Structure formats: C-alpha cells, structure tokens
C-alpha cells in the first residue's frame, strides 16, 4: 500500500490527516489566519485617504525610471500608505491634502514587477476618478 491508510473503520484518521496536512497551503493558511483583516485596508477592497505628499520612487532591475507615488493616510485605519499614481500626467492632478481612493495592484502582495515597496493604486482625487481627469472632455477642478 501507500502511506494513506485504506480501512473502512479508519475514516477518522484520514479526516484528521487532511485537516492537518492541509495547513501546508498558503491560500488556506492565509484566510484561515485572519490575515486579510490585518492589512492596511482591513480586508477592504478600497480605502479613502489624505495625500501626505507626492514622492517619487525608482524602478528596479532592468528598468530605470521615476515612478509617481503619493504617500497617503487612510481614514479609519490611520496608516502610512505607498500609492502609485497611474498613467502619464496623473500626479499633476493630485494636490497635497486632497482626498484619494486607493485599491491594490494584482493580488494583494507583490507590487507590479517594476515598483519596489508600493502595493497601491490611486483612483480618485477629491472624489473624481482619475481616468476622468486624464481625458480632457471629462472633468477637472
């Protein structure tokens, strides 16, 4: 036989074994350990915040570039956040102290290959979708 036991009377055994050997899964181990609740958004999908300052960050390995980023202060959470401002002129709209809406970039964890320690995207300025501010015929204040 193999490692696993094949008895009709040994269900219990197999059961406990699976519940145990199962902790070896990160996806499991992750949600199981209320880890999602401890991140900056507290599980949340999005978070409002105030711009603490627009800072720039350098690209990594084969890339060399000045990334646009805003240091934000989340509201009820109250944490320092590193937030990447999307497309071209974008940072030209973010005025310091305005209200911003941030969300993650591809599965909360690794930032885009290029960025260093940034885990967030900026989608709203004073409650005005960026895309909107990006295309003239849309909006501006």
């Amino acid at each position: 036989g193999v490692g696993k036991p094949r008895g009709i009377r040994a269900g219990r055994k197999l059961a406990r074994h699976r519940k145990d050997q199962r902790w070896a899964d990160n996806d499991f181990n992750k949600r199981l350990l209320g880890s999602r609740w401890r991140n900056p958004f507290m599980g949340a999908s999005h978070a409002k915040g105030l711009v603490t300052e627009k800072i720039g960050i350098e690209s990594k390995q084969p890339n060399s570039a000045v990334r646009k980023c805003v240091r934000v202060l989340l509201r009820k959470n109250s944490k320092k956040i590193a937030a990447f401002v999307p497309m071209d002129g974008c940072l030209n709209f973010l005025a310091e102290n305005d209200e911003v809406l941030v969300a993650g970039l591809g599965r909360q964890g690794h930032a885009v290959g290029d960025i260093p320690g940034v885990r967030f995207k900026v989608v709203c300025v004073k409650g005005i979708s960026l895309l909107a501010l990006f295309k003239g015929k849309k909006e501006k204040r």
């Binding site: 627009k54 720039g56 000045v66 646009k68 071209d88 002129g89 974008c90 940072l91 030209n92």
Partner: peptide, 11 residues
C-alpha cells in the same frame, strides 16, 4: 524629479 511630470504628453 517631479517637475518632470508628464514630460511626454505635454511634448
């Protein structure tokens, strides 16, 4: 930089 924002589009 900073002031180098959107250098491309402007040009």
């Amino acid at each position: 930089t900073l002031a180098k924002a959107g250098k491309v589009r402007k040009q």
